[PDB]
């Protein structure tokens, strides 16, 4: 998903990056939509059906 969100574009897209060295630490789009929630975490189950 990280590769899909950063590396695919038919035109230039705004993107911002985070400090930590983990996948999905970026903010994409004109609005500041943080993608940290989509990283899997079994203790809370964010980013999936649960």
């Amino acid at each position: 998903l990280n590769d899909y969100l950063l590396y695919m574009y038919n035109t230039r897209v705004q993107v911002n990056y985070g400090p930590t060295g983990e996948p999905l630490d970026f903010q994409i789009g004109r609005n500041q939509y943080d993608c940290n929630v989509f990283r899997a975490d079994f203790a809370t189950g964010t980013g999936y059906n649960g």
């Binding site: 990056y17 060295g21 983990e22 996948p23």
Partner: protein, 50 residues
């Protein structure tokens, strides 16, 4: 820039050289693999310059 370049951890075999140098905050205690290391990790100066 805002990095701890020099630190002292334990006594060394030679008592006159206790300092540990670390560029960009990278720790030398952990081995790395050239194929995949360095992907998605930044330090302050590089991020600000970008």
């Amino acid at each position: 820039w805002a990095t701890i370049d020099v630190e002292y951890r334990e006594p060394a075999p030679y008592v006159h050289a206790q300092r540990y140098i670390r560029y960009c905050g990278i720790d030398s205690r952990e081995l790395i693999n050239p194929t995949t290391y360095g992907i998605g990790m930044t330090y302050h100066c590089y991020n600000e310059m970008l």
